[PDB]
Amino acid sequence: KVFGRCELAAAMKRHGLDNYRGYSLGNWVCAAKFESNFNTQATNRNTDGSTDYGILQINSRWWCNDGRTPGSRNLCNIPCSALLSSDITASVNCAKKIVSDGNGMNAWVAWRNRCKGTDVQAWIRGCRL
Numbered sequence: 001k002v003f004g005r006c007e008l009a010a011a012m013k014r015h016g017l018d019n020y021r022g023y024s025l026g027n028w029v030c031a032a033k034f035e036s037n038f039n040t041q042a043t044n045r046n047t048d049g050s051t052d053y054g055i056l057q058i059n060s061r062w063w064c065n066d067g068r069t070p071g072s073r074n075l076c077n078i079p080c081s082a083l084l085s086s087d088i089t090a091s092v093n094c095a096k097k098i099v100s101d102g103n104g105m106n107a108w109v110a111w112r113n114r115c116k117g118t119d120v121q122a123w124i125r126g127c128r129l
Ligand SMILES: C[N+](C)(C)CCO
Pocket: 062, 075, 101
């Protein structure tokens, strides 16, 4: 599923992500934009052999199991394929764990490089939320 901006904002709010760990909804929408272009089915292989999955590009090195990342962990206790669903619940639940692990949203390098410090409220501008 490819979400619209306001549609994704609403789904993220519906699942408890707005202001989770102090990160406003615009931060989460901005991260999803630059991680996946709002596409729940996005997958990208990393040079180390792990793969990032879904709307928030969650890594199989630590967070989900894909059966092909030797030496990795599965800290969200989910198959990585569950992070590709049209329903964002699994990605949201896992992102809540990631953002709580100590470095906040810096875990998402694209958030640090493209969203952090910017006018992230522009991502939810005009949305009926
Ligand atoms: C090891 N990480 C910090 C990357 C995640 C585990 O908490």
